[PDB]
């Protein structure tokens, strides 16, 4: 039982060299979504704004598949995120290193998919002038891979709406919109596409 | 002697691989309980408040047990928390990563049960507006597992009154109420429950 979970965790990670990242020949799709919970700080003296959110990532590796009855009918398991490869999905316009606010544990399932939603706090670039008006401001921050083009890592959203069903009521900022938009860019030089999800939120001071 | 202790610690940890966490085949019950020492700071400008507390946590594994009459009449021992599986209980509305203020050492008693009480400082989302009076504010934090549902980790509390017998006398706030109440919950979609201990504190400046 726990026998089988232990032996399966010992049937994917030692006996297999860790995965070397996706390539143009074996690309990888990474579906990404946001779950926003507060706008903790704003700083018009420097135009940092701090968000607290959940960043949900999901991808699929064949080096992680198994046969469920060959291991006690185990459909899925939880594991520390350090045990597995994870994509380098990061914020293009941060101003401080991200702080991690939660454990970093992932679920790997018998077909071989990880899902991993850690809680973070991000300082990024935004002009807040207008927070107190009745239009608010509009900030944006882009999120993409840092070394992989659209030919190695494809980015995806399962919705354009940022899950707000858990935004802190008594926050000091009301959210008017919360968008998460896959955007494909090309460059004059290069055939391969570069992907990102633009996370733009319009928001207001509490009135 | 301490040589007996050293052998017991070796037999448990050295040739038996570590617990891979609970499955619903073999679920786990984890009891919580806070011991609040101080409300250190409110920030009326960001809507965060900082608590120093103790998180007592208990659980029980058939793998951490042994027969004392084979290890020199040893009832129990103390060990670094890094040497054992520890549950992933987490504040869902934290704002800055939690700071540990104590050693992380657990007591394993011979029936496989475990207790473990780190000291922590936590920053979470809370409106302090109205902490310039008497009736006071209340705000709350839900603690719960990050990847485990009620079919895996059954959360629980013994008492539902936060222990206040060691709160700081001269603290710049003082507490009126302080409860730790378990909450179960389901989602329209999904059969498994989702548990969380809700910690809620009514407090106000000293007079």
């Amino acid at each position: 039982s726990q026998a089988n979970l232990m032996r399966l965790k010992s049937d994917l990670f030692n006996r297999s060299p860790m995965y070397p990242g996706p390539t143009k020949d074996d690309p990888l799709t990474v579906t990404l979504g946001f779950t926003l919970q507060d706008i903790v700080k704003v700083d018009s003296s420097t135009n940092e704004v701090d968000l607290v959110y959940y960043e949900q990532q999901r991808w699929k590796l064949n080096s992680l598949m198994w046969d469920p009855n060959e291991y006690g009918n185990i459909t899925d398991f939880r594991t520390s995120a350090a045990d597995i490869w994870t994509p380098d999905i990061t914020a293009y316009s941060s101003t401080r290193p991200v702080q991690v606010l939660s454990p970093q544990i992932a679920v790997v399932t018998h077909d071989g998919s990880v899902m991993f939603i850690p809680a973070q706090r991000l300082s990024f670039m935004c002009d807040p002038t207008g927070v107190d008006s009745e239009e608010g401001v509009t900030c944006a921050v882009k999120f993409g891979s840092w070394v992989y083009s659209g030919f190695e890592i494809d980015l995806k959203t399962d919705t354009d709406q940022v899950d707000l069903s858990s935004y802190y009521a008594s926050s000091k900022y009301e959210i008017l919109s919360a968008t998460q938009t896959r955007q494909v860019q090309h460059y004059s030089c290069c055939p391969e596409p570069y992907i990102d999800v633009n996370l733009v939120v319009k928001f207001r001071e509490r009135r | 002697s301490q040589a007996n202790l050293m052998r017991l610690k070796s037999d448990l940890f050295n040739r038996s691989p570590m617990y891979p966490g609970p499955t619903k085949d073999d679920p786990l019950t984890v009891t919580l309980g806070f011991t609040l020492q101080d409300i250190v700071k409110v920030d009326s400008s960001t809507n965060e408040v900082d608590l120093v507390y103790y998180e007592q946590q208990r659980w029980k594994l058939n793998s951490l047990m042994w027969d004392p009459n084979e290890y020199g009449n040893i009832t129990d021992f103390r060990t670094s928390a890094a040497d054992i599986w520890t549950p992933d209980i987490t504040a869902y509305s934290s704002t800055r990563p939690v700071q540990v203020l104590s050693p992380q050492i657990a007591v394993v008693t011979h029936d496989g049960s475990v207790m473990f009480i780190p000291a922590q400082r936590l920053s979470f989302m809370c409106d302090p507006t109205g902490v310039d009076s008497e009736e006071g504010v209340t705000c709350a934090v839900k603690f719960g597992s990050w990847v485990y549902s009620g079919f895996e980790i059954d959360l629980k509390t013994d008492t539902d009154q936060v222990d206040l017998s060691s709160y700081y006398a001269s603290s710049k706030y003082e507490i009126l109420s302080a409860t730790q109440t378990r909450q179960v919950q389901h989602y329209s979609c999904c059969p498994e429950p989702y548990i969380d201990v809700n910690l809620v504190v009514k407090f106000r400046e000293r007079r």
Binding site: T35, I117, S165 | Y194
Partner: peptide, 16 residues
Amino acid sequence: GCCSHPACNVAHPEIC
């Protein structure tokens, strides 16, 4: 309304 909560968000990719 699950995806707002991490343990179920990872339990239910189909929904989230």
